[PDB]
Amino acid sequence: KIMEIKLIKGPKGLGFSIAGGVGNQHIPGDNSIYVTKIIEGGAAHKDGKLQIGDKLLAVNSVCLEEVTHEEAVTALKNTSDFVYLKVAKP
Amino acid sequence: ATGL
């Protein structure tokens, strides 16, 4: 089940960590980017939609499927205050 | 993992 998440980055940034990526599989066979910690009262947390275990599919139509950890991190660090996430739930 |  794919969902849309729209965020406003805060003073602690977006408020979550990721893993995975081509060459850094978080789950064997799966090169995807996964959300691994949602941080207390950060942006992601206040909004409430994003969940530990969520696959990230996109950020601002920069595509996060089959990319490297650092390609994903780059794209997520290269964001304004306005952040759109497309995710797939388990 | 990478904090964002």
Curated annotation (Swiss-Prot), chain A:
<protein>
    <recommendedName>
        <fullName>Disks large homolog 1</fullName>
    </recommendedName>
</protein>
<feature type="modified residue" description="Phosphotyrosine">
    <location>
        <position position="84"/>
    </location>
</feature>
<comment type="similarity">
    <text>Belongs to the MAGUK family.</text>
</comment>
<feature type="domain" description="PDZ 2">
    <location>
        <begin position="4"/>
        <end position="90"/>
    </location>
</feature>
<comment type="subunit">
    <text>Homotetramer. Interacts (via guanylate kinase-like domain) with DLGAP1, DLGAP2, DLGAP3, DLGAP4 and MAP1A. Interacts (via guanylate kinase-like domain) with KIF13B. May interact with HTR2A. Interacts (via PDZ domains) with GRIA1. Interacts (via PDZ domains) with GRIN2A. Interacts (via PDZ domains) with KCND2 and KCND3. Interacts (via PDZ domains) with KCNA1, KCNA2, KCNA3 and KCNA4. Interacts (via PDZ domains) with ADGRA3. Interacts with KCNF1. Interacts with CAMK2. Interacts with cytoskeleton-associated protein EPB41. Interacts with cytoskeleton-associated protein EZR.</text>
</comment>
<comment type="function">
    <text>Essential multidomain scaffolding protein required for normal development. Recruits channels, receptors and signaling molecules to discrete plasma membrane domains in polarized cells. Promotes epithelial cell layer barrier function via maintaining cell-cell adhesion. May play a role in adherens junction assembly, signal transduction, cell proliferation, synaptogenesis and lymphocyte activation. Regulates the excitability of cardiac myocytes by modulating the functional expression of Kv4 channels. Functional regulator of Kv1.5 channel.</text>
</comment>
